[PDB]
Design an enzyme around this catalytic site. Structure first.
Site, PDB file in Angstrom:
ATOM      1  CG  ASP B  32      38.334  59.779  36.668  1.00 59.95           C
ATOM      2  OD1 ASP B  32      37.145  59.559  36.961  1.00 59.95           O
ATOM      3  OD2 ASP B  32      39.259  59.705  37.492  1.00 59.95           O
ATOM      4  CD  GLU B  34      33.107  59.607  27.158  1.00 57.33           C
ATOM      5  OE1 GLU B  34      34.100  59.197  26.516  1.00 57.33           O
ATOM      6  OE2 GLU B  34      32.140  60.190  26.619  1.00 57.33           O
ATOM      7  CE1 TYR B  35      33.217  66.489  34.257  1.00 58.65           C
ATOM      8  CE2 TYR B  35      35.600  66.645  34.301  1.00 58.65           C
ATOM      9  CZ  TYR B  35      34.363  67.205  34.551  1.00 58.65           C
ATOM     10  OH  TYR B  35      34.292  68.497  35.013  1.00 58.65           O
ATOM     11  CG  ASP B  36      40.156  65.704  30.318  1.00 54.45           C
ATOM     12  OD1 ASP B  36      40.031  66.801  30.908  1.00 54.45           O
ATOM     13  OD2 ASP B  36      40.877  65.563  29.298  1.00 54.45           O
ATOM     14  CB  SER B  81      29.959  79.248  66.555  1.00 56.04           C
ATOM     15  OG  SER B  81      29.541  79.992  67.691  1.00 56.04           O
ATOM     16  CG  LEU B  82      28.168  73.613  66.453  1.00 58.58           C
ATOM     17  CD1 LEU B  82      28.901  72.438  65.840  1.00 58.58           C
ATOM     18  CD2 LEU B  82      26.692  73.305  66.574  1.00 58.58           C
ATOM     19  CE  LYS B 116      33.312  71.088  66.453  1.00 57.46           C
ATOM     20  NZ  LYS B 116      34.652  71.503  65.947  1.00 57.46           N
ATOM     21  CE  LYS B 291      23.631  71.270  63.353  1.00 62.08           C
ATOM     22  NZ  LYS B 291      23.760  71.741  61.947  1.00 62.08           N
TER      23      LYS B 291
HETATM   24  C1  LIG Z   1      41.498  63.837  33.795  1.00 60.58           C
HETATM   25  C2  LIG Z   1      40.536  63.724  34.950  1.00 60.58           C
HETATM   26  C3  LIG Z   1      39.196  64.018  34.790  1.00 60.58           C
HETATM   27  C4  LIG Z   1      38.314  63.943  35.847  1.00 60.58           C
HETATM   28  C5  LIG Z   1      38.744  63.548  37.108  1.00 60.58           C
HETATM   29  C6  LIG Z   1      37.734  63.366  38.222  1.00 60.58           C
HETATM   30  N1  LIG Z   1      36.328  63.549  37.789  1.00 60.58           N
HETATM   31  C7  LIG Z   1      35.640  62.488  37.236  1.00 60.58           C
HETATM   32  C8  LIG Z   1      34.355  62.611  36.800  1.00 60.58           C
HETATM   33  C9  LIG Z   1      33.721  61.416  36.148  1.00 60.58           C
HETATM   34  N2  LIG Z   1      34.375  60.263  36.045  1.00 60.58           N
HETATM   35  O1  LIG Z   1      32.567  61.507  35.723  1.00 60.58           O
HETATM   36  C10 LIG Z   1      33.726  63.885  36.966  1.00 60.58           C
HETATM   37  C11 LIG Z   1      34.394  64.935  37.481  1.00 60.58           C
HETATM   38  C12 LIG Z   1      35.753  64.824  37.918  1.00 60.58           C
HETATM   39  O2  LIG Z   1      36.427  65.770  38.327  1.00 60.58           O
HETATM   40  C13 LIG Z   1      40.109  63.255  37.305  1.00 60.58           C
HETATM   41  C14 LIG Z   1      40.676  62.907  38.658  1.00 60.58           C
HETATM   42  C15 LIG Z   1      40.971  63.347  36.213  1.00 60.58           C
HETATM   43  C1  LIG Z   2      24.908  75.300  63.154  1.00 64.49           C
HETATM   44  C2  LIG Z   2      26.244  74.710  62.809  1.00 64.49           C
HETATM   45  C3  LIG Z   2      27.407  75.501  62.833  1.00 64.49           C
HETATM   46  C4  LIG Z   2      28.618  74.935  62.568  1.00 64.49           C
HETATM   47  C5  LIG Z   2      28.707  73.554  62.292  1.00 64.49           C
HETATM   48  C6  LIG Z   2      29.906  72.898  61.953  1.00 64.49           C
HETATM   49  C7  LIG Z   2      29.919  71.553  61.666  1.00 64.49           C
HETATM   50  C8  LIG Z   2      31.207  70.814  61.383  1.00 64.49           C
HETATM   51  N1  LIG Z   2      32.346  71.380  61.747  1.00 64.49           N
HETATM   52  O1  LIG Z   2      31.166  69.698  60.851  1.00 64.49           O
HETATM   53  C9  LIG Z   2      28.729  70.821  61.669  1.00 64.49           C
HETATM   54  C10 LIG Z   2      27.537  71.431  61.979  1.00 64.49           C
HETATM   55  O2  LIG Z   2      26.384  70.723  61.916  1.00 64.49           O
HETATM   56  C11 LIG Z   2      27.500  72.818  62.294  1.00 64.49           C
HETATM   57  N2  LIG Z   2      26.279  73.406  62.549  1.00 64.49           N
END
Ligand SMILES: Cc1ccc(Cn2cc(C(N)=O)ccc2=O)c(C)c1
Ligand SMILES: Cc1ccc2cc(C(N)=O)cc(O)c2n1
Ligand SMILES: Cc1ccc(Cn2cc(C(N)=O)ccc2=O)c(C)c1
Ligand SMILES: Cc1ccc2cc(C(N)=O)cc(O)c2n1
EC number: 6.5.1.2
Lengths: 317, 317
Positions: B32, B34-36, B81-82, B116, B291
């Site tokens: 992390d 290095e990313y920062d 919606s489901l 879900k 589904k």
């Molecule tokens: C300071 C800092 C920088 C990044 C992150 C988390 N993270 C890591 C990467 C990574 N390792 O490639 C990529 C994006 C990202 O959001 C945290 C929690 C703290």
């Molecule tokens: C078509 C549809 C609509 C809402 C949904 C919502 C979720 C869910 N709450 O994870 C997952 C699904 O596959 C869904 N699929």
């Protein structure tokens, strides 16, 4: 008190009662010539004394001026549509799912069964027994204002047959064109170099989209109510069939083929009976609409919107 | 060509690739820290050369100015919606009805199964790989513009990881708050005399309703895509699981617990497995979404709106 006012109130009560007999009971107590004698006698007296004219009088069904377009109405309660089945086994699965989903399943599971009319769904509002507005189903949330066109329909009462009408009652029904009227309309349309209709549903849809009510009045349209929306100032029956008998009893036309069946096997007997009667009904039907009769079980089962038939969320207990 | 422009293009490509590894693969190739190092080096160089700033750069997720309110967006395709089930028998009826309704039932009926998520449904539009708009589901026809809030979400790419993105791609997914982030947020909220949340779904709903994106960015929100809406300039896979693997492959986060099951008995095994894993997932779930995997069978089965569970129209053949 005046003799004219008394005369006009008597004529209006008599005509309304004859319209109920002729349209809803299909048992007129007098000949059509007698009904017309009283009707144009009332129309004459109202024109000679315009001060005693009422907007809901039997003679005021046609708006003498056309509309420019239709306004949009958002329904207070959503207008539902139906899901479908194409086989005895698919119907038996729809039932089996309900048996599993219900907390307590009654000994006989009673269904209110009726022919599925090939018409157009409409909502009609009565405020203190007076027809105030009417709308198309549209998308179930928004429809179009068709008040002027619905007033022209002969079997639609302009006022409910009751001395104690609900504060607000919204009737939901199908507007259709019977075979006999559709045949006349096409004979007239072809012998006047006008547009003929492919089937009675297209004829009914075209009649309700007319901006001029004078045209709509010459289209032989009919209503059969299937349900209630808004209902304020009334204790509605707790079974669907009793609600339809109640609407019939206050001047609303309902289909005469409606029956109560106990369980899927009796319901399948109804479907077969209505399928064999198709060629004799005098109007078009698509199948049968089968509902759970008990209103508490309806409220328990609820409704779906807008969900696929290819997905289900199996929830955790 | 300039060294600065080359420097900025390299930093942006490297950061986007690290974000994909960290967020979608859960397998970062660098620490992390290095990313920062690269992130704030890019932020510094863009501010020193404002002419080379891009709106979709990794450093531009937070809109520095709050909104006044949210606009309304009508979806081009309706957001579904489901429907639900509460028992093995009710699930077995939903399957039995599909077997009866399908014209041809395949040897193994394959289902794509997933947990879900207890989140909020959102739609996110990518025009030529660039995030342009985002909206809530609302009523499935109309939702609210939440573009500025969705851009703040760390695992939501501002640009798709592909050299040949679709002309228009609309990703549908759930925005939720994991247990770890919800616990931090409440610790911070209670130790700052601020409003604590009852559960992570209310925390997620409250974060997305913030008009100031600077607040939304400090809420640990996450996306998992479940489906596609609009898709122009692309040949989408013909199975639902392959579409989710394709979204994953172009930089979109998807749930790692998704599996393919053949028939109701294998699907019930998945439900039981996910039910026993509930206490270990690190986020909230309500059940399992099951589904039909084949997209042609989905198109054949279709969808319902707005229909009662207590009525069916048995149509004539
Ligand atoms: C300071 C800092 C920088 C990044 C992150 C988390 N993270 C890591 C990467 C990574 N390792 O490639 C990529 C994006 C990202 O959001 C945290 C929690 C703290
Ligand atoms: C078509 C549809 C609509 C809402 C949904 C919502 C979720 C869910 N709450 O994870 C997952 C699904 O596959 C869904 N699929
Ligand atoms: C001239 C004329 C008058 C009435 C009718 C049909 N009809 C009859 C009655 C009736 N018998 O009580 C009531 C209303 C109504 O519409 C037709 C076809 C022709
Ligand atoms: C709830 C609802 C909606 C539309 C309907 C339509 C019909 C019909 N087409 O006859 C009958 C019904 O009992 C209906 N019931």
């Amino acid at each position: 008190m005046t003799n004219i006012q008394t005369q006009l109130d008597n004529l209006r009560k008599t005509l309304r009662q004859y319209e109920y007999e002729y349209h809803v009971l299909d048992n007129p107590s007098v000949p059509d010539s007698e009904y017309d004698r009283l009707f144009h006698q009332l129309k004459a007296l109202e024109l000679e004394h315009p001060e005693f004219l009422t907007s809901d009088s039997p003679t005021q069904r046609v708006g003498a001026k056309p509309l420019s377009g239709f306004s949009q109405i958002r329904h207070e309660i959503p207008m539902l549509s139906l899901d479908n089945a194409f086989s005895d086994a698919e119907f038996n699965a729809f039932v089996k799912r309900i048996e599993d989903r219900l907390i307590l399943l009654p000994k006989p599971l009673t269904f209110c069964c009726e022919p599925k009319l090939d018409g157009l769904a409409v909502s009609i509002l009565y405020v203190n027994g007076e027809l105030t507005q009417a709308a198309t189903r549209g998308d179930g949330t928004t429809g179009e204002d068709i008040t002027a066109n619905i007033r022209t329909i002969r079997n639609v009462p302009l006022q409910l047959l009751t001395d104690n009408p609900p504060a607000r009652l919204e009737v939901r029904g199908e507007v259709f064109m019977p075979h006999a009227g559709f045949e006349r309309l096409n004979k007239y349309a072809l012998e006047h170099n006008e547009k003929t209709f492919a089937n009675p549903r297209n004829a009914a849809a075209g009649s309700l989209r007319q901006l001029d009510p004078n045209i709509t009045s010459k289209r032989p349209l009919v209503l059969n109510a299937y349900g209630i929306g808004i209902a304020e100032g009334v204790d509605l029956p707790t079974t669907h069939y009793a609600r339809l008998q109640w609407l019939k009893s206050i001047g609303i036309p309902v289909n005469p083929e409606i029956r109560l069946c106990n369980g899927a096997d009796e319901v399948l007997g109804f479907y077969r009976d209505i399928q064999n009667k198709r060629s004799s009904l005098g109007y078009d039907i698509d199948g049968t609409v089968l509902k759970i009769n008990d209103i508490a079980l309806q409220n328990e089962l609820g409704f779906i919107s807008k969900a696929p038939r290819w997905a289900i969320a199996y929830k955790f207990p």
